[PDB]
Ligand binder design. Structure first.
Ligand code: HEM
Ligand SMILES: [Mn+2]
Length: 291
């Protein structure tokens, strides 16, 4: 199974910058969402969940086909809490009907990271919507009640190594957990609508206590009111992950560089780009455009 990237007819960098802008402007418009967390974290989680269905062994799932638009995937229990993010992008798709679903969902994540003062993330167009019978079954996204061995083996399916895994998990600086979505409660950090290396700092510097929450799940809690999933906490239980957590806690610039690379890779898994395909785009933020 091969997915060849196909540029949307007659579309170039400037067309996609306008889609970026529409997303980024709507982020400002709806910045009150979830007591001023805004939609940024949800768009990042959405981009990851639509990419994270990939299986490298047979190239099923992945961002290419834009299959999240189909009810089987949209209603995956693992995707609870993303519906509002989907609905956020819906009017933007209607405004730019020419863009593919996969391109729009992935671009949403890129836009959100950059507008939350994160790293620039190069982005490529060319995902092509595929039919409903190409939708991956539920159950491909990872469980949070697991250990380091699980995290490591899980991410092998996405062709991610230790550094890529630890870098990607740093997106938990953003947003929060909600009992009604995932059975977990609380934020990882204080500044959770800004993309920083706070996740790693909090992992290392808070005192964590294992507690049962109101959903009967166990999570690691601090007296500052922060929490860590068991899979988060496994990054300091495992000696190889620990070393990398320390590196990113000490050097946000390095975290940013490694995250940019791993996130683009995540969003592009499964896609074959023709040799004459356009080079990756790096979009300007609203601020850089004086918008
Ligand atoms: C072992 C892999 C992972 C597990 C188990 C996991 C688990 C979770 C859970 C349980 C939540 C709370 C969801 C809710 O209740 O609404 C969450 C939120 C979130 N995750 Fe992850 N995650 C993983 C990997 C990643 C990666 C790799 C990224 C980023 C590239 C990411 C980005 C996010 C973001 C942005 C949110 C917050 C969304 C919001 O505030 O609504 N996660 N995750
Ligand atoms: Mn949320």
């Amino acid at each position: 199974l091969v997915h060849v990237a196909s540029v949307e007819k007659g579309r170039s960098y400037e067309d996609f910058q306008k889609v970026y802008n529409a997303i980024a402007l709507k982020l400002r418009e709806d910045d009150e969402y979830e007591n001023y967390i805004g939609y940024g974290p949800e768009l990042v989680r959405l981009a990851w969940h639509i990419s994270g269905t990939w299986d490298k062994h047979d190239n099923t799932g992945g961002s290419y086909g834009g299959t999240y638009r189909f009810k089987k995937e949209f209603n995956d229990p693992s995707n609870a809490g993303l519906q509002n993010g989907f609905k956020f992008l819906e009017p933007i798709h209607k405004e730019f009907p020419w863009i593919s679903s996969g391109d729009l969902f992935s671009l949403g994540g890129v836009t959100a990271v950059q507008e939350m003062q994160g790293p620039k993330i190069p982005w490529r167009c060319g995902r092509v919507d595929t039919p409903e019978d190409t939708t991956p079954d539920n159950g491909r996204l990872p469980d949070a009640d697991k250990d380091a061995g699980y995290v490591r083996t899980f991410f092998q399916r996405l062709n991610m190594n230790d550094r890529e895994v630890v870098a990607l998990m740093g997106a938990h600086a953003l947003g929060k957990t909600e009992l009604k979505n995932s059975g977990y409660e609380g934020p990882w950090g204080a500044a959770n609508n800004v993309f920083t290396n706070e996740f790693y700092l909090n992992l290392l510097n808070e005192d964590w206590k294992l507690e049962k929450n109101d959903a009967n799940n166990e999570q690691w809690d601090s007296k500052s009111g922060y929490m860590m999933l068991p899979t988060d906490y496994s990054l300091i239980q495992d000696p190889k992950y620990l070393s990398i957590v320390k590196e990113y806690a000490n050097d946000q610039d390095k975290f940013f560089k490694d995250f940019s690379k791993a996130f683009e890779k995540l969003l592009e898994n499964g896609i074959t780009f023709p040799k004459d395909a356009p080079s990756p785009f790096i979009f300007k933020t609203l601020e850089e455009q004086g918008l």
